[PDB]
Design a protein around this nucleic acid. Structure first.
Ligand code: MG
Ligand code: MG
Ligand code: MG
Ligand code: MG
Ligand code: MG
Ligand code: MG
Ligand code: MG
Ligand code: MG
Ligand code: MG
Ligand code: MG
Ligand code: MG
Lengths: 190, 138, 345, 199
RNA sequence: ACCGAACGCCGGGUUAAGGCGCCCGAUGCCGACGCUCAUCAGACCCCAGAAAAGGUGUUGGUUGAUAUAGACAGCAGGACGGUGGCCAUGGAAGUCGGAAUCCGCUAAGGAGUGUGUAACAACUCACCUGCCGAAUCAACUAGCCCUGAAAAUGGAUGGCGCU
RNA sequence: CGUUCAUAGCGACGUCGCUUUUUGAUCCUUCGAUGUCGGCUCUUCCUAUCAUUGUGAAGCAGAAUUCACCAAGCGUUGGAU
RNA sequence: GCGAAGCUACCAUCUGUGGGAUUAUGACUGAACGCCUCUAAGUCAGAAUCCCGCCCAGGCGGAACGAUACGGCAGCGCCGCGGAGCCUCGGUUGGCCUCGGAUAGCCGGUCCCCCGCGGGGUCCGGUGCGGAGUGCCCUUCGUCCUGGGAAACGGGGCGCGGCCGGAGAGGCGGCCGCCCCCUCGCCCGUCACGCACGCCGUUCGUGGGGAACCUGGCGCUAAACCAUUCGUAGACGACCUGCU
């Protein structure tokens, strides 16, 4: 049935400054800005407190599937806050029984050439989503680092280079190869 | 981003129905879509009333959620809602609209004549202003 | 019941109403996309199929069994004397389509061209563009022209140049030159329009438009073959000797019950004189015409770096059912659509 | 004497029915900005619904068979035609009163144009439901001239922004003019709020 | 051939059975309360179409647990001994199967859910805590929706359409 | 059954369906006649998919493979009796 | 026998293309359900599929431009302003425009900041069952006279020349010089206008659309088809060509 009211709060940290054009939260701080439009979620994004300390998300007369959005908006905002403060660092380790997947970034992070996967002549170039910057790490031999503010864009761009390196017409229980996401962390922890 | 609420003791204007064009304090909320309502001073008997037909003002007079009519009458008269309502812009444009409907054909003619002149005096002022402003631009 | 033994169907449906082409000169149905960056150029030309011949060449595709071997290769000669630009014409983008907006014609126009505007010339007084050319020599007209170009510069997007052939220079019987719109593709509309304005009443040879070893698409009407039976027109099976009411037919037009013969069934009708757009015909050689410095330079045509004779692409006794290719010509690999003497886009 | 409706924001069938009855009663109707018409139910739903309609064709000679117009204007015109007696003379006459346009061209661009609030999406659908823009739908089913219509509408919107700005500036002068003059219009202005305007 | 109603020729009224977005006369009611979204929605006797069986899709019911004596999932720590227990040897010391089937230590672990072993081993599956902070969870049942659900000209809630 | 393991692939005893490319029932239509088998020729449609495209499954190491999904675009031949 | 031309053969030779939406599927972020989940809101990849491209035909669908009957009788194109006279009818103030949003909007003004008189921002002040309201706005609807007041340089002469803006199907406006004429909106007085004797299609857009007819001014000076010819064409028509 219709639930007379539901809500949540998201305590923004004093480092960050969030502002909301109606239903379009813009979060800015140390690393940069992140906007996100929730026109499509249908909620009361209040922003209360002196020092602007917390974001409050109401949702009046919701049925069960409407009340599921309440939390999700809050969570995306959390991730948006994180991305502005710390940032996201997805580490992904290359795997192979033979063909040592030769990775090499190109323009800056942007492009990822993935040569000699399974002995294939076909070089897999893979773009990144704007803002995300791939980089080949040190202190770990076969391993990539994807950093960026917007988690969505980072994790998708990881998935691009995970699915790029896929094995066709074989027993994938046997042929375990490719670049896979090993650790989803931040750029800086505090 | 709401400013007006179905609160106990909110005065509301009944848009339409039998008790149209009347103020009414919400006594208590019965349901999703039905309020138990009163307007002692506005000639509206205690009864249930659907929210559909009532649009709600910016006047929350304070009484407890299921008082016995006497007390809401006192809260109405204490705040002097009838006087406050009439002074509001809303009530004035209701009054305006009523007057326009009542307007007789002689009255109508009088207005026509009055506007005919009144707009002409504005029009000359506007044209002059524009030409002078043209003078400022030059 | 189902057809027993499968076979693919005869002829394409992507080519039909197999009817006699309404045009004669083949229409450029779609010019290439102008990327506003590279410099301006004409996109199309208008030539005449003179004939065919061999070529010989060393081939350089590594891997093949024919790598560094001399092959022979059929070619068409297409006599393509230079085109004179006589008009320009602006187009505007609309949601309806691509409306033609403003056509400016040149001051002077040849009788080659004028010919085209009359169905009978002998009979006519040849009064075409008489009151038009007046515009080019006065204040009011020259001012009206300049505004029209400036309007085209403002509002139009696509600009095509109207060019026409120099029928004068061909062995053909007809004097009535073909006009044609040719799309200018290049920089901004203004720059495009100034270039066309500069080219007005001027020659445009082939070598400007096309280079050598360039793939081009030939567009023309097919050699027409009159009314033709279903066995010629669709290459259906001939029925066997015994068939009582003729055997150059299709036996079963259609099933009973969609009780109408379909548009997909093979019937007899016009075979040929269809409009057709062939693609990827490699220009092997753009040739120079005959010219004079003291005596004739007939050599420059069919002489090569390895032959060095004094030949013209004209074979002995001329090209058959045509004439002497005296003018500049291209030389396409393979055949091209249409008969001899046929105007070819 | 001529209804011009802004097809934007309206429901395909819901606008059509209102247009249809008006057209039958002799009113000349113009519907404009048809690409902005939007149809209930998700996009994919309605794409498939169109692609079925495309499959319907006269097997033996498709040239006769149902003419699947791609243009959003012509789509709207088709659905309106479905709500007329369009085989009759009166039905045809009625259809000839109707006039429908992709985007908003020059006679109607400088005309104030109404909105049917009974066919309006904001009113008629729940806010958690999905709907399809009839521009996209038309675009994906064949319609060629989405991009062209789009660019022309930018130009139109820019030209309209100016017009509005000038209208605002005049309205501002009018408001100031009234304040300049409010002692020599006082006993006219008084009577225009006894009989109930200005208030 | 169903439902209503049975016909001289007309005016006014009123109905039936059916209807009232538009085609098409009538809801252009500020109609009332719910339910349902379907990448095959659904849409009215006869009638022109679907079943068993499924579904934390959503909505109601019914019956029961377990719980500040600190749940329930989620992050983690042990899982024994009397004991190769007995039948079965072809090997089953918990473990192809089956009769059994209790005690100790107990905080507590079945003479054992499985993985797997020739057989073990090794691993895995209560009772209790540490963190976190209010409801949690189970089995039925019935509404709408979905799966189940395949035909040959292009096609029919009558059509347009409708959320 | 499948060494083991109900369900990879199967599936008894039972049970619920769809189809009109089988054959029966039936006798509504046509007996002042709808030319009665096959083959040849030609088009089109269906999918209950053999192949080909993209995929999920395995008792898929590879190769070969069956099982399933989107899918009817394109194919699906030459002969002996 | 041999055989030109012409037809003609995988029996010779040449050419056969690029995108978009997504399906199955695999994924992302992520609730529902402190965890988990491809999904619920949102996002990604994705195909012999589908739609388009190229390609063929081109609508009782449009386009720009050319030329527009010298004449031996001609006949017309514009422009402006006049008289009758068939016919076809519908109508019976206008509205000259932001964009859009909807769990939000509209207007101001910026003291202050940035951008090209405007645009964008912040801040503040007003509105918001919308009165800078389509529940709206504009316009008035008898004619004249004279003789006061408030309002007063506004209107006209299809008044006349220049400079603009407008191309999506422009079809409309705007702004600037000069000539002559008038005193029009709002109140009052002051009379008079066939007052046709109670009675229907009145009242306008209207100088309407079309067809036939009388005046001025400035312009014009044909193509098409047949016949003939040709063979890139052809059953016949059609088509491509030629002809002081
Ligand atoms: Mg294999
Ligand atoms: Mg077959
Ligand atoms: Mg015989
Ligand atoms: Mg098409
Ligand atoms: Mg009965
Ligand atoms: Mg077994
Ligand atoms: Mg027969
Ligand atoms: Mg299938
Ligand atoms: Mg998916
Ligand atoms: Mg995609
Ligand atoms: Mg794609």
């Amino acid at each position: 049935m219709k639930t007379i009211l539901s809500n949540q709060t998201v305590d923004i940290p004093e480092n960050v400054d969030i502002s909301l054009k109606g239903r379009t939260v813009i979060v800015k701080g140390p690393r940069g800005t992140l906007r996100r439009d929730f026109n499509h979620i249908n909620v009361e994004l209040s922003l209360l407190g002196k020092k602007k300390k917390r974001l409050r998300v109401d949702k009046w007369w919701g049925n069960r599937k409407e009340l599921a959005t309440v939390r999700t908006i809050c969570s995306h905002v959390q991730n948006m806050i994180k991305g502005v403060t710390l940032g996201f660092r997805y580490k992904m380790r290359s795997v192979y029984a033979h063909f040592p997947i030769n990775v090499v970034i190109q323009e800056n992070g942007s492009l990822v050439e993935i040569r000699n996967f399974l002995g294939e002549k076909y070089i897999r170039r893979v773009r990144m989503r704007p803002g995300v910057a791939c980089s080949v790490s040190q202190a770990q031999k076969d391993e990539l680092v994807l950093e960026g503010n917007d988690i969505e864009l980072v994790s998708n761009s990881a998935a691009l280079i995970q699915q790029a390196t896929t094995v066709k017409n074989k027993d994938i229980r046997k042929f375990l190869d490719g670049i896979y996401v090993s650790e989803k962390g931040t750029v800086q922890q505090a | 981003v709401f400013r007006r609420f179905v609160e106990v003791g909110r005065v509301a204007y009944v848009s339409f129905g039998p008790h149209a064009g009347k103020l009414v304090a919400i006594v208590d909320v019965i349901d999703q879509n039905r309020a138990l309502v009163d307007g002692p001073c506005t000639r509206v008997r205690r009864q249930a009333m659907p929210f559909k037909c009532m649009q709600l003002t910016d006047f929350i007079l304070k009484f407890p959620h299921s008082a016995r009519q006497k007390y809401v009458r006192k809260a109405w008269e204490k705040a002097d809602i009838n006087t406050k309502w009439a002074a509001t812009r809303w009530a004035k444009k209701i009054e305006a609209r009523e007057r326009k409907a009542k307007m007789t054909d002689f009255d109508r003619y009088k207005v026509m004549k009055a506007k005919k002149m009144r707009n002409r005096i504005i029009k000359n002022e506007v044209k002059k202003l524009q030409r002078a402003a043209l003078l400022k631009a030059s | 019941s189902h057809r027993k033994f499968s076979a693919p169907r005869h002829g394409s449906l992507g080519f039909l109403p197999r009817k006699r082409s309404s045009r004669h000169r083949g229409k450029v149905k779609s010019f290439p996309k102008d990327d506003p960056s590279k410099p301006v150029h004409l996109t199309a030309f208008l030539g005449y199929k003179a004939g065919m011949t061999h070529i010989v060449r060393e081939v350089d595709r590594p891997g093949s069994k024919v790598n560094k071997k001399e092959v022979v290769e059929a070619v068409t000669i297409v006599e393509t004397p230079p085109m004179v630009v006589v008009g320009i014409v602006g187009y505007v983008e609309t949601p309806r389509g691509l409306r033609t907006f403003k056509t400016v014609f040149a001051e002077h126009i040849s009788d080659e061209c004028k010919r085209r505007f009359y169905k009978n010339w002998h009979k006519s007084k040849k009064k075409a563009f008489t009151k038009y050319c007046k515009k080019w020599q006065d204040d009011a007209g020259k001012r009206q022209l300049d505004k029209d170009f400036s309007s085209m510069k403002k509002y139009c997007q696509v600009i095509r140049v109207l060019a026409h052939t120099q029928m004068r220079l061909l062995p053909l019987r007809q004097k009535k030159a073909h006009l044609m719109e040719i799309q200018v593709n290049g920089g901004t509309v203004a720059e495009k329009l100034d270039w066309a304005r500069e080219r007005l009443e001027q020659q445009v040879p082939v070598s400007q438009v096309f280079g050598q070893d360039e793939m081009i698409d030939v567009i023309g009407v097919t050699k027409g073959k009159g009314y033709k039976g279903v066995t010629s027109r669709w290459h259906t099976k001939k029925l066997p000797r015994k068939t009582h009411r003729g055997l150059r037919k299709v036996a079963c037009i259609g099933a009973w019950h969609p009780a109408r013969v379909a548009f997909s069934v093979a019937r007899a009708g016009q075979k040929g004189y269809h409009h057709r757009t062939e693609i990827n015909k490699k220009i092997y050689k753009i040739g120079q015409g005959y010219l004079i410095k003291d005596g004739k330079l007939i050599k420059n045509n069919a002489s090569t770096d390895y032959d060095l004779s004094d030949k013209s692409i004209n074979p002995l006794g001329g090209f058959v059912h045509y004439g002497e290719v005296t003018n500049d010509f291209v030389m396409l690999k393979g055949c091209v659509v249409g008969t001899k003497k046929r105007v070819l886009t | 004497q001529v209804l011009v409706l802004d097809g934007r924001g309206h429901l395909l069938g819901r606008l059509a029915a209102i247009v249809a009855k008006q057209v039958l009663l002799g009113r000349k109707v113009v519907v404009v900005r048809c690409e902005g018409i939007n149809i209930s139910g998700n996009f994919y739903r309605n794409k498939l619904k169109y692609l079925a309609f495309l499959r319907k064709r006269m097997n033996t000679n498709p040239s006769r068979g149902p003419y699947h117009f791609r243009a959003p204007s012509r789509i709207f015109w088709r659905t309106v035609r479905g709500m007329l007696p369009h085989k009759t003379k009166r039905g045809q006459a009625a259809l000839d009163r109707l006039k429908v346009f992709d985007g908003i061209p020059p006679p109607y661009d400088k005309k104030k144009r109404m909105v049917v609030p009974a066919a309006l999406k904001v009113v008629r659908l729940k806010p958690t439901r999905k709907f399809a823009y009839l521009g996209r739908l038309a675009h994906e089913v064949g319609w060629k001239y989405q991009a062209v219509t789009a660019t022309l509408e930018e130009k139109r919107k820019e030209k309209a922004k100016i017009h509005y700005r000038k209208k605002k500036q005049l309205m501002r002068l009018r408001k100031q003019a009234e304040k300049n003059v409010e002692k020599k219009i006082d006993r006219f202005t008084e009577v225009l709020k006894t009989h109930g305007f200005l208030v």
